[PDB]
């Protein structure tokens, strides 16, 4: 007679795999938007819940960020080595130009940088 | 005349007539007496005269 | 500075019947005359749904606050309004009787009653469309729903299985091309069949009461019928929905051509609300045949009773009854009416321009542009097979169109030109 | 819908002073929180006046009334149709105050949670009435 | 810690280990709580998403997980205030003035007893200067009591009491109520004994 | 170069401005909750819930800026 | 106060006006004095069960209160 | 050159000013909703909706500023 | 070098800005509590717990700021 | 050296900002205590206690800044 | 050297910020005291005392600032 003492007020939820099936995912959350495309639809179709998706993508992010940061260390010079060589000589070209137009006192100190606009 | 319980629940919805000098929680109970005593006081006079 | 005119008068010099397009004309008619005239408006319904973004609304690209607008907002503050329908029209006496019975006189009448929806044409339809769970869907939302109801967005999503029917009522009806969502559903329902969300034994057919989809544009109707076949959709012409049983999910159809009716099980049903001609326009002898106003195609002026005009859907014009089509009709009516009050001639002619988007995919569309003679402009049926071009044009109509109807009703933004 | 310029009704269970009057120009009373002023076009609202003073201006002098009264407590209601009604337990003029006759045997009170507030009000009126005479 | 003074060469040994223990196991309390939520643990913190992009929520969900720990780790700044304020008082008391002028029969003759010791402070020393030194002493100890007594409560009232009130709860719905109906039947079986007034 | 680096670290300090407004916005929200509670203590649940929900959005902007801070500091 | 008198104690508004005038009943003219009078009888109605006379009207006699 | 670049990153930091005001304005709006709820809690859904709606308009300015930031940061 | 270090210490001063708003937000919070308390003292306990609770979240941001302060000053 | 000290002492001056806000919050706190007392003076002592309690949490932030001030001024 | 002296004399000026906030806080406190007095004049002496008490707390910050000011100006 265990069903005699079972309280039906526990039917407020339908718990299955640590998830309540009576959740209006169509009106709240990442699943509410109906303008989602083939990829976003196939993604939720697999997991059925944003909670499981967000939880898995939580760790996948550390994996991807640590990977791209590695590739940017190992590789990367393929697309930025030019901007470094340019700034290297540019940092020297502008320094050589400063020594030409700058007031140096009896010691090598630019004590008058605001003498004119070109000096600033 | 409706009882206190029905009158209070009905009166708390009052919004057209502002009640801020006494707060609604007090004005609801006070105006209930006026609503009840007025009818009672009026009836006694009619019966006493009759 | 300026004072609001009185609404409790016995007669006016201009009278508009309608708020959707009748309010846009008044707000535009005043700015054209600077308020030299007193115009009255009398609409029937308090709320005007933006059916031009109905599909973006079903995709939840537009919130319910940008899809629902009160009729008062379309009308300006200076012009008075009253939500009472006209009970009868007396052209010989130049007056109008309202539901209450107050006689009102006029010098110029503009009719914009459009096509009034009649849910009673389909028994058991409104009762099922209001149910938050029954799979019966329609083209508009009832007035008994609150902000927490989103059943409109479940027609495409909740089609896990069963027989689907897309019903089109008998012409004239409202929402010819702006409510055809059977191209986006096919693409969305194509994905479901790929991963099993949609059962393989399902049937979706288009039940068209009319013989053709677009009556006044053959080039547009040819593309639709051509694209339906390439996609694999089935159609049944001359058949119109007749009854809806919410208990057993039975839909009684009838082939008007053969008069043979049948009953078919459904699990996801969509139907454009059918219209119905109003008798007070026939008692006055204004409509012609189908029930549309008999007015000129160029000047929009009524054949008889030159002091009466008509625009929108109620007008009998060989063109697609759209909103952009109405934009060009507002400028013409306010012009001719402006010339009628001055006795001058009518130099404003309407070319029959009508512009409505056709959503060919989940995020792609193509504009159906055509003049009176069905001839299309540079936009007619462009980027129809999808692509980057249709994608951008889709976002511009879904994310930036409902934000404009607030201005149209206010007055800050006028028509296209 | 709407009513005329205004109408005020001052009634007492034992006598009616003004069934309906319009000549008055303004009304001022003291509520629990602060003093208010009810005149023409005053929005709809409810008020409960403790036993304080009630002063009302008359454009034309009304017989038997001075326009300055001390009420023992009443209810006030301003209906939506620009109409206010004043109902008090009792009313009298300041000239009949007969001051210095207070505390003539009713000083005793009971030490309870209700008697504390009971005396609180009684003391408030004494302090009020003394000022009302001025 | 007095009874541990002979148990090692460091009087505060047990206190130095306990502060690390206290830190590690309090640092693990949030970690095991997420393990108890499961893979949905991010919904228990932030709730439902807003955008369809998982990458976008990924950034909002990371902030939710950091805040989850910052509510805890940020409360250790309170402990620093308690220590800093405790040291400031030990410094003032340890460096408080004590001289042979306060000693009875001092034999520390070389400790400024036989020298000229003048100052440039306010005279009436015991009336102006020395009371002021005790005035500041009373301030250092009153400020210390307020900080340690207030920050001590705020630490546990937030790290445990409030932290668990936000992320944990108890349900009101019940699954079985067979005690209520047995007590009624059991009370009828004892109806006669109660009639005797036990 | 060296100055732009100095501005980056400087902008990171400016990120503490929402932190200041977030504190005031919190006291203001809880100050109203107290009043709103005394006016009608029957509905503690809704008021209390809407409070933290507001607090959520308030602090959301706070951490949003912190992200923007480190972003400009390294990008 | 009129508000807290009813909140922290079951004192109706009428009872409050009575206790308020209680201290000035003698100051007011006799016209008002005769008006401020409550004297009646209440019986629990069996043949002769109870007969209660309500004459105080200020304490927990006619308008009971939680504080009393 | 680099001077203008320094102002570019500086303006980028300035975008955190509405973020601070958006936080304060949030608490103020919800603080009123709390009081408004206790006053007349029958219209929870109505008042609740208007609250989130207004807030959405706030983040519009916020995101607008950030967009303006990256724009001037790169253009 | 010397410039950036001067800016790091400068930002460390900026952290004292929330400390100011926290004081005002605190007085405002307890200012409302006294009013909310005088309005309905029967429910003091509820108001009181919510009062101190909000205060905790207030100085939480303040402590959070000091973190970022020392961070940039040493990182 | 002195230059870094110059910006340190500059930061040390910033500590007077909470000292300023603390005064305004104090005036606001006692302002509410006065009006709140008038509405329900029966519980004067209760309001008075919570009044001074808030002023303490104010100085909590104040002394905190002064600590942070002197620290960074010498560390 | 000389530059540190300059920032010192400037910080000394910063002490006038609490002097400004303390003024506004005083106006607000007495503003509520007036309204609070009209609400319940029966306790004018109580409100009046607590009123001045708050102001005394306002000057506390004033003395704290000017004190810290002269110190930093000479230390
Ligand atoms: C360069 C360095 C590279 C380094 C590489 C390092 C190595 C990398 C390897 C590892 C890669 C990472 C692994 C990822 C997989 C891991 C799993 C996972 O995370 O999930 C996938 C994950 C899912 O994404 P999601 O965010 O969850 O999806 C969002 C919604 O859910 C989606 O919702 P939806 O599905 O419903 O619909 C989506 C879409 C609808 O989409 C569609 O429908 C299109 C579908 C087309 C399909 C095409 C089919 C093709 C078939 C093949 C061809 C046919 C076959 C022919 C065969 C021929 C054979 C020869 O609807 C929209 O309208 C979207 C909004 C509009 C687009 C917004 C784009 C913003 C970009 C802003 C920057 C603009 C830059 C412009 C200028 C650029 C010039 C360079 O993928 C990603 O996250 C992509 C990366 C996102 C990072 C964004 C941050 C960077 C910002 C952009 C860069 C800005 C420029 C910066 C520098 C510029 C310098 C010039
Ligand atoms: C120096 C490092 C410092 C970091 C220290 C951090 C230490 C953290 C310690 C915490 C403990 C970690 C141990 C985890 C135990 C996991 C055990 C387990 O596996 O049980 C499963 C258990 C899930 O079970 P459940 O939730 O109870 O119920 C599941 C439902 O029934 C399921 O319902 P459903 O069936 O509807 O869901 C569907 C499905 C949905 O799943 C998806 O989302 C799908 C994802 C996409 C998959 C790819 C799809 C590809 C599609 C291909 C399509 C092909 C088409 C072909 C077509 C065919 C064409 C013909 O969901 C799942 O089944 C997956 C759930 C399990 C995922 C477990 C992920 C674990 C990742 C851990 C990686 C790192 C471990 C390192 C350990 C190192 C130890 C030395 O996993 C968890 O509970 C995860 C909880 C972990 C939370 C830990 C958070 C701690 C904080 C970490 C970050 C803190 C940062 C701040 C640092 C501050 C300084 C302190
Ligand atoms: C027809 C008439 C014929 C007769 C006429 C007779 C006329 C007589 C003329 C007399 C001429 C002057 C006498 C000169 C000889 C003085 C000999 C002496 O021992 O003084 C040494 C004494 C210490 O100096 P020193 O040893 O030479 O060392 C040099 C430097 O001090 C060293 O520098 P430092 O910085 O290192 O020193 C620290 C500094 C520390 O800084 C200070 O000076 C401390 C003072 C701060 C408090 C200042 C406020 C005092 C006011 C309190 C009362 C206010 C009431 C009203 C307030 C209303 C507010 C709006 O000084 C001290 O340490 C002072 C400690 C000793 C005083 C504290 C104890 C006082 C006992 C009080 C008991 C009172 C009970 C009643 C008894 C009265 C009779 C015995 O010098 C003085 O204090 C001069 C006193 C000048 C008189 C001031 C007037 C006081 C007014 C009292 C008001 C209440 C009575 C009003 C009566 C009205 C009558 C109409
Ligand atoms: C009352 C509340 C307000 C606070 C005031 C209370 C403190 C009042 C102080 C009264 C002191 C009066 C007697 C002092 C005389 C003896 C000390 C003395 O003379 O000063 C000695 C010396 C100064 O000497 P020089 O500077 O070298 O001067 C040389 C001159 N040729 O000062 C001292 O020795 C310090 C005084 C002794 C400190 C003793 C510490 C006591 C600890 C107190 C803690 C109490 C804990 C309670 C449990
Ligand atoms: N797709 C749809 O289902 C649908 C439905 C309605 C409108 N629309 C769009 O709205 C555009 C313009 O609409 P419209 O102006 O032609 O008509 P309408 O649908 O906007 O309605 C006409 C207005 O007048 C009122 N009305 C109708 N009969 C009335 C009567 N006897 N008395 C008083 N008022 C009366 C209506 O309530 C309404 O305010 C159309 O081009 C169409 O695209 C679409």
Numbering used by the authors:
A (entry chain K3): 1 to 120
B (entry chain g4): 201 to 250
C (entry chain E3): 27 to 443
D (entry chain d4): 24 to 157
E (entry chain A3): 249 to 446
F (entry chain Q4), H (entry chain P4), I (entry chain H4), J (entry chain I4), K (entry chain J4): 1 to 75
G (entry chain e4): 2 to 69
Original paper wording:
The F-type ATP synthase (F1Fo-ATP synthase) is responsible for generating most of the cellular adenosine triphosphate (ATP) from adenosine diphosphate (ADP) and inorganic phosphate through rotary catalysis. In eukaryotes, ATP synthases are found in the inner mitochondrial membrane. The type III ATP synthase was detected in ciliates where it induces tubulation of the cristae membranes.
The tetramer was refined to 3.3 Å resolution and the membrane region consisting of interacting Fo subcomplexes was further improved to 3.1 Å resolution upon masked refinement. Two copies of the ATP synthase dimer model were refined into the Fo-tetramer map generating a composite ATP synthase tetramer model. In the tetramer, the ATP synthase dimers are spaced 140 Å center-to-center with an angle of ~11° between dimer axes bringing the Fo-subcomplexes together. The analysis of the interface forming the tetramer revealed that the specific N-terminal helical bundle of subunit-a functions as an adaptor for subunit-i/j and ATPTT6 that are positioned to engage in interactions associating two neighboring dimers in a tetramer. By extrapolation, the same interface is available for the addition of multiple dimer modules, all with an angular arrangement represented by the type III ATP synthase tetramer structure.
